RNA sequence: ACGGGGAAUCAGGGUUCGAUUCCGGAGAGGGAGCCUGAGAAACGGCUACCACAUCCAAGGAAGGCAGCAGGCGCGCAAAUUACCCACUCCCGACCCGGGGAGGUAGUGACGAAAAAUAACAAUACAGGACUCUUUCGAGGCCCUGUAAUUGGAAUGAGUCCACUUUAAAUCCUUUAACGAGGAUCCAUUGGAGGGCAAGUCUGGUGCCAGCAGCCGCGGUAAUUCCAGCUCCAAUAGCGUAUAUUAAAGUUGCUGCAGUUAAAAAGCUCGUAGUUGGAUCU
């Protein structure tokens, strides 16, 4: 078939710049945070266990 | 979640059935 | 039933090897016709010259045009159709240019939609396709 | 801490007889030749091409 | 031919199932509780424990009066008692099968430095060890994964060439004192 | 297909790999024939022929890197035309000379070991547990985090004297001086429907572009494409292609199947093969 449409969608996608952000901790300190986020202080529980990325 | 059971029962065989079943278990 | 006597070792071994010849993978690996017919000649990758850009129809349940290239391997001259993975990536390839081709993922078997295609382009003009796609490198002049 | 080895010789002449040359050079009692391995090897292979006394005429 | 040795080992093994909730949670619990850098340290400790259990299981099937069983079982039990993992009152071979991973993780220099009160956290303990503030007997130890021997435990000090033990101020104190 | 010692994987049994530093064999572009020598059918010895190929004043002469470097070619695929006999040893007439054997550096994400990229205190709190009170409150014990909120402490990555190292050096180790708040001295590679851990959030596209190992996603409300944000897996590493092992009790000795899923010869005889009843203190 025709090869004229070869970069169509990537070409028409509007460009959005990445936001500036703090650096993320690495190594032991990143694993520490995760441990704190998942195991240290989690009191609320309504029988759902919402995922870490529950947008809705 | 009851919402998961509802969304699964609406379309037991659909684009979102596998995810909702995995959530139910 | 199978023989079970203490002196039946030769019968068991001969039967096992004869029946081993009836296994698809074993026969493919040990007969020598598959390696002869393999365009890569048993190599993991190969290098070829782009002959033309071609568009291949996707299989019936889904409609699309898969952008591939006809390449001629340097080491044996065999002609091959190789898939150019990402979008816009066909624009990184020109005619009569060096390309490094690898397998598609299932041991010389066609993958997914694309019919009769078992190779994908890894490098174009000695620069990786991923680097070109992500803007890390530009096409040499 | 540091750990090493030491030798104390009965006399300086005995030390000069028994010590390896580089250790004497560390004390300043010995000097090595200034030629390189390549220089000597090429000189040897050049001398190999000439007969008796002319061997001394190539360097 | 060269004069080199090529004997080397892999100190860990990788789990067969990469994504499963229970294993990931248990490993994360261990990492957070003992201040570990990654899961490779957990798998390393798991591998040493697995090798020890395999040796013990090999020895158990042997005869009780078998001299090989007696010899290597005694050696294994004495090695385990020496590093503090086993109790001297539990010096029978089968008790080796009762050991857990936390027993081996508790004998690290990091956890012992935290337990002795030289540091106020397990992570503070790790940074204290890696910053050459900790010595065992007279040797300054720099490695957090230093399995502390049972006799060596009583000699864990602050490394008298360090600011916390030897009273010599470091870079920051000196610079901030020069500003006065 | 050089053979072994061995290597990868493996419950048990197995399958695969072994050109590769130790032992044995073979060869020095391909064959053949020899001299010397205790020991070669030796090629860093010689004599021919075959194939290549160097210089030539055209009469002639000289060749053999599957040694160390290095070049070409082939390819998916592999390092310096470095220093040294100081160590291990070897050779010689030899305590002395020589050794691209060998050692030392260089290149080196083959692969293996260790191991940074922050720690703490104070605040202020989403805050939580713990605690009395009657709800607030109190609870100032303990923990977590937006903390572009504060604060001093500790450091090595670097720069760099001097030792030490070494044949001479380098590296590592040891020590001066300098060296951290976005501590910008800024971790990546792959993913987020299921298998399989993690968003039917937002914008664009609209069976196109593409993704997708497999099932599938996309035809105007895409949990799957192109991106932003967020999230998770491993982490100084992580994707991809190919060989192979386990998974495979899908080669079945352990341990599979043959009525209908693939499968018992049309039937009988019969050599080799395999197996073969009690019984002897
Ligand atoms: Mg061969
Ligand atoms: Mg073999
Ligand atoms: Mg070999
Ligand atoms: Mg070969
Ligand atoms: Mg050999
Ligand atoms: Mg020979
Ligand atoms: Mg050759
Ligand atoms: Mg010969
Ligand atoms: Mg030669
Ligand atoms: Mg020779
Ligand atoms: Mg060479
Ligand atoms: Mg090339
Ligand atoms: Mg390579
Ligand atoms: Mg020597
Ligand atoms: Mg010598
Ligand atoms: Mg060598
Ligand atoms: Mg260098
Ligand atoms: Mg790699
Ligand atoms: Mg490694
Ligand atoms: Mg350093
Ligand atoms: Mg990412
Ligand atoms: Mg996305
Ligand atoms: Mg998935
Ligand atoms: Mg999931
Ligand atoms: Mg893929
Ligand atoms: Mg998906
Ligand atoms: Mg297999
Ligand atoms: Mg099995
Ligand atoms: Mg079957
Ligand atoms: Mg049938
Ligand atoms: Mg029948
Ligand atoms: Mg018969
Ligand atoms: Mg009988």
Curated annotation (Swiss-Prot), chain A:
It is found in: Cytoplasm; Nucleus. This is Small ribosomal subunit protein eS30. Component of the 40S subunit of the ribosome. Contributes to the assembly and function of 40S ribosomal subunits. Component of the 40S subunit of the ribosome. The chain holds residues 78 to 133 of 133 of the full protein. Residues 7-33 are annotated as: Disordered. Residues 20-33 have a biased composition (Basic residues). It comes from Homo sapiens. The modification N6-succinyllysine is found at residue 48.
From Swiss-Prot, chain C:
There is a cross-link at residue 36 (Glycyl lysine isopeptide (Lys-Gly) (interchain with G-Cter in SUMO2)). The modification 3-hydroxyproline is found at residue 61. InterPro entries: NA-bd_OB-fold (IPR012340), Ribosomal_uS12 (IPR006032), Ribosomal_uS12_euk/arc (IPR005680). The keyword Nucleotidyltransferase does not apply. Residues 1-19 have a biased composition (Basic residues). The modification N6-acetyllysine is found at residue 134. GO terms for molecular function: RNA binding; structural constituent of ribosome. One of its GO terms (biological process) is ribosomal small subunit biogenesis. Hydroxylation at Pro-61 affects translation termination efficiency. Disulfide bonds: none annotated. One of its GO terms (cellular component) is ribosome. Component of the 40S small ribosomal subunit. Part of the small subunit (SSU) processome, composed of more than 70 proteins and the RNA chaperone small nucleolar RNA (snoRNA) U3. Belongs to the universal ribosomal protein uS12 family. It is linked to Brachycephaly, trichomegaly, and developmental delay: An autosomal dominant developmental disorder characterized by brachycephaly, ciliary trichomegaly, dysmorphic features of the face and hands, hearing loss, and developmental delay with short stature. Intellectual disability and autism spectrum disorder may be present in some patients. This is Small ribosomal subunit protein uS12. It comes from Homo sapiens (Human). The gene is RPS23.
Swiss-Prot record, chain D:
Residues 25-59 are annotated as: Disordered. Transmembrane segments: none annotated. Residues 34-52 have a biased composition (Basic residues). Mature tissues, such as adult brain, skeletal muscle, heart, and kidney, express low levels, whereas tissues and organs with significant populations of proliferating cells, such as fetal brain, placenta, bone marrow, and various glandular organs, contain significantly higher levels. It is found in: Cytoplasm; Nucleus, Nucleolus. Belongs to the eukaryotic ribosomal protein eS24 family. It is linked to Diamond-Blackfan anemia 3: A form of Diamond-Blackfan anemia, a congenital non-regenerative hypoplastic anemia that usually presents early in infancy. Diamond-Blackfan anemia is characterized by a moderate to severe macrocytic anemia, erythroblastopenia, and an increased risk of developing leukemia. 30 to 40% of Diamond-Blackfan anemia patients present with short stature and congenital anomalies, the most frequent being craniofacial (Pierre-Robin syndrome and cleft palate), thumb and urogenital anomalies. Component of the small ribosomal subunit. Part of the small subunit (SSU) processome, composed of more than 70 proteins and the RNA chaperone small nucleolar RNA (snoRNA) U3. This is Small ribosomal subunit protein eS24. It comes from Homo sapiens. The chain holds residues 68 to 126 of 133 of the full protein.
Curated annotation (Swiss-Prot), chain E:
InterPro entries: Ribosomal_uS4, Ribosomal_uS4_CS, Ribosomal_uS4_euk/arc, Ribosomal_uS4_N, S4_RNA-bd, S4_RNA-bd_sf. There is a cross-link at residues 92, 138 (Glycyl lysine isopeptide (Lys-Gly) (interchain with G-Cter in SUMO2)). Changing residue 136 to F: In a breast cancer sample; somatic mutation. The modification N6-acetyllysine is found at residues 65, 115, 154. It comes from the Eukaryota. Signal peptide: none annotated. GO terms for cellular component: cytoplasm; cytosol; cytosolic ribosome; cytosolic small ribosomal subunit; extracellular exosome; focal adhesion; membrane; nucleolus. This is Small ribosomal subunit protein uS4. The modification Phosphoserine is found at residues 152, 162. GO terms for biological process: cytoplasmic translation; positive regulation of cell population proliferation; ribosomal small subunit biogenesis; translation. Component of the small ribosomal subunit. The ribosome is a large ribonucleoprotein complex responsible for the synthesis of proteins in the cell. Part of the small subunit (SSU) processome, first precursor of the small eukaryotic ribosomal subunit. During the assembly of the SSU processome in the nucleolus, many ribosome biogenesis factors, an RNA chaperone and ribosomal proteins associate with the nascent pre-rRNA and work in concert to generate RNA folding, modifications, rearrangements and cleavage as well as targeted degradation of pre-ribosomal RNA by the RNA exosome. PANTHER family: 30S 40S RIBOSOMAL PROTEIN (PTHR11831), SMALL RIBOSOMAL SUBUNIT PROTEIN US4 (PTHR11831:SF46). GO terms for molecular function: RNA binding; rRNA binding; structural constituent of ribosome; translation regulator activity.
């Amino acid at each position: 078939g025709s090869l004229a449409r070869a970069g169509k969608v990537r070409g028409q996608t509007p460009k959005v710049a990445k936001q500036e952000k703090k650096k993320k901790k690495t190594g032991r300190a990143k694993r520490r945070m995760q441990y704190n986020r998942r195991f240290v202080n989690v009191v609320p529980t309504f029988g759902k266990k919402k995922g870490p990325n529950a947008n809705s | 979640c009851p919402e998961w059971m509802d969304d699964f029962e609406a379309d037991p065989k659909g684009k979102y059935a596998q995810n909702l079943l995995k959530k139910l278990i | 039933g199978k023989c079970r006597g203490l002196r039946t070792a030769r019968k068991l071994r001969s039967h096992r090897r004869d029946q081993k010849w009836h296994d698809k993978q074993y026969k493919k690996a040990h007969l020598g016709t598959a390696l002869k017919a393999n365009p890569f000649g048993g190599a993991s990758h190969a290098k070829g010259i782009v002959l033309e850009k071609v568009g291949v129809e996707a299989k019936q349940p889904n409609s699309a045009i898969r952008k591939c290239v006809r390449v001629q391997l340097i080491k044996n001259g065999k002609k091959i159709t190789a898939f150019v993975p990402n979008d816009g990536c066909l624009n990184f390839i020109e005619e009569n240019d060096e390309v490094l081709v690898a397998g598609f993922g299932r041991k010389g078997h066609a993958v997914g939609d694309i019919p009769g295609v078992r190779f994908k382009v890894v490098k174009v003009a000695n620069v990786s396709l991923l680097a070109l796609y992500k803007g890390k490198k530009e096409r040499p002049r | 801490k540091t750990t090493g080895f030491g030798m104390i010789y009965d006399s300086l002449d005995y030390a000069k007889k028994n010590e390896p040359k580089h250790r004497l050079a560390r004390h300043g009692l010995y000097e090595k030749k200034k030629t390189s391995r390549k220089q000597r090897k090429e000189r040897k292979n050049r001398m190999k091409k000439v007969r008796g006394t002319a061997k001394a005429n190539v360097g | 031919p060269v004069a080199r040795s090529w004997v080397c080992r892999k100190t860990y093994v990788t789990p067969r199932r990469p994504f499963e909730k229970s294993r990931l949670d248990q490993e994360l619990k261990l990492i957070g509780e003992y201040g570990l850098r990654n899961k490779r340290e957990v798998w390393r400790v798991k591998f040493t424990l697995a090798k020890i259990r395999k040796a013990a299981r090999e020895l158990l099937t042997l005869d009780e009066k078998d001299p090989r069983r007696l010899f290597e079982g005694n050696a294994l039990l004495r090695r385990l008692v020496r590093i503090g993992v086993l109790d001297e009152g539990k010096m029978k071979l089968d008790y080796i099968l009762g050991l857990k991973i936390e027993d081996f993780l508790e004998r690290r220099l990091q956890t012992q430095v935290f337990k002795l009160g030289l540091a106020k956290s397990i992570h503070h303990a790790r940074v204290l060890i890696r910053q050459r503030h900790i010595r065992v007997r007279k040797q300054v130890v720099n490695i957090p994964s230093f399995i502390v021997r049972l006799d060596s435990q009583k000699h864990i000090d602050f490394s008298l060439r360090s600011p916390y033990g030897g009273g010599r101020p470091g870079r920051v104190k000196r610079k901030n004192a020069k500003k006065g």
